[PDB]
Amino acid sequence: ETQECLFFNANWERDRTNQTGVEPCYGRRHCFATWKNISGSIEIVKQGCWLDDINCYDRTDCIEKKDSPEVYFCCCEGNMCNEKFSYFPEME
Numbered sequence: 886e887t888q889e890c891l892f893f894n895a896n897w898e899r900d901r902t903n904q905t906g907v908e909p910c911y912g913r914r915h916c917f918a919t920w921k922n923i924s925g926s927i928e929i930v931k932q933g934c935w936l937d938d939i940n941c942y943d944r945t946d947c948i949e950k951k952d953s954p955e956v957y958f959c960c961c962e963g964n965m966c967n968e969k970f971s972y973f974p975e976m977e
């Protein structure tokens with residue numbers, strides 16, 4: 886049930902991609918986000934489709950449940966589901 890995702894690439898200039906947009910998923914499809922979070926300050930690394938087989942923490946919402954990771958990651962199902970992404974560590 887995922888055909889398209891929010892696209893973001895902080896390395897767009899060297900990678901020769903758009904900086905942002907809508908990615909069409911081809912290649913079960915998912916969307917994902919990866920980000921840094923230092924003392925509450927969030928920096929997106931990438932957003933887009935995720936095509937390899939994977940399991941996510943929530944079906945609908947993009948959520949990271951690992952505890953204090955250096956690079957945060959989430960995946961989700963549903964068109965544009967990765968526009969919102971949250972941190973709910975298992976330790977809570």
Ligand SMILES: *[C@@H]1O[C@H](CO)[C@@H](O)[C@H](O)[C@H]1NC(C)=O
Nearest residue numbers: 892902903905906907908909
């Ligand atoms: C990149 O932006 C172009 C328009 O300039 C659009 O046609 C394309 O689908 C976009 N792709 C991504 C992955 O954002």
Ligand SMILES: *[C@@H]1O[C@H](CO)[C@@H](O)[C@H](O)[C@H]1NC(C)=O
Nearest residue numbers: 922924925927957970971972
């Ligand atoms: C970022 O880290 C702060 C704590 O320093 C936490 O309250 C917040 O949930 C985190 N947000 C994301 C999107 O990772």
